[PDB]
Ligand binder design. Structure first.
Ligand code: ATP
Ligand code: MG
Ligand code: ZN
Lengths: 48, 623, 109
């Protein structure tokens, strides 16, 4: 019954190693991150 | 049983797995480990165990030669069915390490075995069906590499009726394991693996391809897959040529045999040992560095040792030395930055070994990144956002300028570049930071690097009758950011021709089949100096420097040449800084100031037309 | 004098390779004798190692002591003969101990 339920906010992010130190001839690695509730809409892409 | 294993009961796999023979071979392996020794009488394996324990390592390297000479039968059985005796010898090594070091299980519950010195060598194209499920030693080139993934080792299961956590169950690395009975519920219902209470290990997949050198004419290089586990991950990177000893086996899982068509099976290699077919230093060579630095004439000593395979061009070599050492950056109150990298431009006629200089710099420098304005290059010059060929994920990749931060960027054929790349270099040289606004990403990246470039004049031949500005397609904004402009003219001279010709022909005849510091020490010298030296200035040279600058300004304005501007003074100071650095000293000397004055003044004068150049030669004949 | 030799310069160890296919009971019996000899030599203070190397001075062995020349060069006893290191049988070791008069029979909360 959706009229009497409560929900929250969930979000995904991708984190990449700093491009300066990548080894030559390689593509940089990255990881997936999950955050929720009050840790959503805190950063924007490009931030360190 | 005692060395009666020569009698065979059935196929080798069936024979080896019998318990009594298992104990027999276990004890025999124990005797090998605890009694082997070479002629010298030193405990090879005892010392190996000692170093392993003290270092807190996890694997024993073993020599197939020793094993075969001692207990040949074991070596043959190993070549035939390596799968089982790897486990047997693992337990042997575990108990031996427990005997030496107590409670090693507290830190490591397993010690692996890495075989070595396998006698037979194979190429990836020689494998056939008779080599399946055996020990092989191949050699190839790494072509692609995946990330590191966790793989189950000790799995635990949750019962969903009673919340019981079932105990450890080993994962054999052959198929996934399952359970069907709950000790407390006496049930068989659902189960789920417990992520938090599981112990994993490392997993990686690599692609090997035959080395292009060895393939016979008219055929293609084959390739294979390789599996690395535990501590073998991230040991080799793409482009390195390696030898791998491992177990050759099918992908028995495949997908399924309901597939239509012929029943063909794929194959892989499970790696056991991997081996490739530096700038760190120590006190022993640090005292050596200091001893060499204390010597006089160290500047010429270093300069003479650059690009040994090229004759002459001392100005080129000294410029390369100065830009390869580099100065010291500065920042006044964090509001006025001064760069510390020296920029050199080469401008020469065809057939001058400019590309050879660039290749030598690439091989010698710590962090050198190559690129070109035309041709095939592993990387471009502009930052971008690209899809990943394998992981199918967006990635942000900077150009060679970004990737070579705190390093050197080499550009070949500088004059044939396009609009985007020229803009990128202009930005990097002017600001040392590359902006980017793409795919929702807005940011800036550091690009502090030293640039070395090569080019050719308009028409392929230098016109000494005109100023340098009109001999190239480059524009003044990009030409003024350099500080060492080298111009090479292919003027014809007899003696030079004989010297160069004898050089080249003698090199060729040596290369037919049938003073300078050693390079290995030199690279460490560069690294240590750059890491540990930061020369300073003395306020007693201001009079000399100011008088020189005033004199140059006056003469230049009198002769109506390219203006002399404080950029030249800054370059002089930077070059003197680099010169002082190369001596390992902490202060700048009048000798270094003299050398920097020489270099800068010569570079400026050499780039003028004939009349102006001749006029200035007399004026600045003091140097 | 023998005790001085022992507690100063006697590095010892025991061969773990046997020349007879004994049953588990007899193997355990000789192992118990081995342990008794270990404790006996410990009482006299000679070092007992865990691996053969040229430094060792006595090896104590069950196998034959008259047929070393027939063994392999890689063989431990062959190495001992080459290095002039002293080889004892278990009976010889027991005799030596008896002659030196080493008696073998004898938080929560
Ligand atoms: N002074 C020299 N001494 C020895 N070999 C030289 C010299 N100058 C050129 N060479 C050789 O001649 C050939 C010239 O090609 P290279 O690419 O090295 O020259 P470059 O000056 O970069 O010219 P470009 O790129 O315009 O062809 C190469 O084999 C180079 O090794
Ligand atoms: Mg070239
Ligand atoms: Zn249950």
């Amino acid at each position: 019954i959706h009229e009497s339920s409560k929900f929250i906010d969930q979000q995904f992010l991708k984190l990449q190693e700093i491009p300066e130190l990548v080894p030559v001839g390689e593509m940089p690695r990255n990881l997936t991150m999950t955050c929720d509730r009050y840790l959503t809409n805190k950063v924007i892409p490009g931030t360190r | 049983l005692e060395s009666l294993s020569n009698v065979k009961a059935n196929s080798y796999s069936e024979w080896i797995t019998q318990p009594n023979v298992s104990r027999t071979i276990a004890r025999e392996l124990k005797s090998f480990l605890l009694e082997y020794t070479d002629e010298t009488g030193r405990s090879v394996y005892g010392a190996r165990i000692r170093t392993l324990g003290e270092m807190n390592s996890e694997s024993l390297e073993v020599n197939y030669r020793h094993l075969a000479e001692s207990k040949a039968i074991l070596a043959l059985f190993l070549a035939k069915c390596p799968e089982e005796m790897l486990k047997i010898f693992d337990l042997v090594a575990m108990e031996a390490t427990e005997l030496h070091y107590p409670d090693y299980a507290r830190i490591h519950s397993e010690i692996h075995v890495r075989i070595s010195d396998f006698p037979t060598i194979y190429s990836l194209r020689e494998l056939r069906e008779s080599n399946l499920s055996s020990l092989v030693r191949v050699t190839g080139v790494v072509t692609r590499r995946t990330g590191v993934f966790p793989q189950l080792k000790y799995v635990k299961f949750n019962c969903l009726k009673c919340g019981s956590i079932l105990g450890p169950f080993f994962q054999d690395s052959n198929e996934e394991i399952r359970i069907s009975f709950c000790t407390n519920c006496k049930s068989k219902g659902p189960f789920r693996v417990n992520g938090e209470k599981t112990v994993y290990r490392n997993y990686q997949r690599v692609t090997l391809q035959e080395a292009p050198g060895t393939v016979p004419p008219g055929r293609l290089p084959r390739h294979r897959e390789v599996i690395l586990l535990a501590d073998l991950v991230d040991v080799s990177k793409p482009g390195e040529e390696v030898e791998v000893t491992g177990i050759y086996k099918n992908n028995y899982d495949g997908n399924l045999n309901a597939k239509n068509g012929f029943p063909v099976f794929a194959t892989i290699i499970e790696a056991n040992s991997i081996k490739r077919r530096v700038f760190s230093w120590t006190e022993e060579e640090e005292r050596e560095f200091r001893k060499i630095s204390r010597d006089r004439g160290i500047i010429d000593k270093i300069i003479s040792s650059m690009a040994p395979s090229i004759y002459g061009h001392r100005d080129i070599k000294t410029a390369v030395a100065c830009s390869l050492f580099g100065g010291v950056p500065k920042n006044v109150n964090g509001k006025h930055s001064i760069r510390g990298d020296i920029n050199v431009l080469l401008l020469g006629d065809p057939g001058t070994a400019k590309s050879q200089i660039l290749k030598y710099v690439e091989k010698t420098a710590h962090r050198a990144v190559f690129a070109t304005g035309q041709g095939a290059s592993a990387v471009g010059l502009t930052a971008s956002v690209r899809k990943d060929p394998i992981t199918k994920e967006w990635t942000l990749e900077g150009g060679a300028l970004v990737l070579a931060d705190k390093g050197v960027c080499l550009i070949d054929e500088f004059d044939k570049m396009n609009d985007q790349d020229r803009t990128s270099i202009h930005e990097a040289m002017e600001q040392q930071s590359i902006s980017i606004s793409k795919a929702g990403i807005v940011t800036t990246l550091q690009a502090r690097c030293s640039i070395i470039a090569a080019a050719n004049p308009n028409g392929g031949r230098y016109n000494s009758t005109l100023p340098l500005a009109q001999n190239v397609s480059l524009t003044e904004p990009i030409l003024s950011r350099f500080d060492i402009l080298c111009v090479v003219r292919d003027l014809v001279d007899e003696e030079a021709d004989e010297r160069l010709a004898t050089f080249v022909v003698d090199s060729h005849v040596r290369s037919h089949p049938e003073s300078p510091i050693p390079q290995e020490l030199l690279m460490k010298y560069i690294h240590y100096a750059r890491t540990k030296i930061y020369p300073k200035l003395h306020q007693m040279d201001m009079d000399k420097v100011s008088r020189v600058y005033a004199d140059l300004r006056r003469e230049s304005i009198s002769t109506g040449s390219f203006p002399i501007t404080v950029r030249h003074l800054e370059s002089i100071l930077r070059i003197a800084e680099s010169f002082a650095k190369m001596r390992l000293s902490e202060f700048v000397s009048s000798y270094d100031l003299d050398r920097a004055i020489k270099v800068v003044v010569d570079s400026f004068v050499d780039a003028q037309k004939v009349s102006v150049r001749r006029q200035l030669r007399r004026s600045f004949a003091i140097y | 004098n023998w005790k001085k030799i022992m507690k100063r310069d006697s590095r010892i160890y025991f061969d773990i390779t046997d020349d007879v296919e004994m049953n588990t009971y007899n193997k355990s019996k000789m192992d118990k004798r081995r342990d008794l000899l270990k404790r006996g030599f410990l009482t006299l203070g000679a070092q007992i190692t865990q691996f053969f190397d040229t430094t060792v001075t006595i090896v104590i062995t069950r196998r034959s002591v008259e047929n070393i020349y027939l063994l392999k060069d890689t063989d431990i006893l062959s190495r001992a003969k080459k290095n002039y290191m002293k080889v004892w049988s278990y009976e010889k070791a027991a005799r030596f101990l008896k002659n030196l008069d080493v008696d073998l029979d004898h938080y929560f909360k």
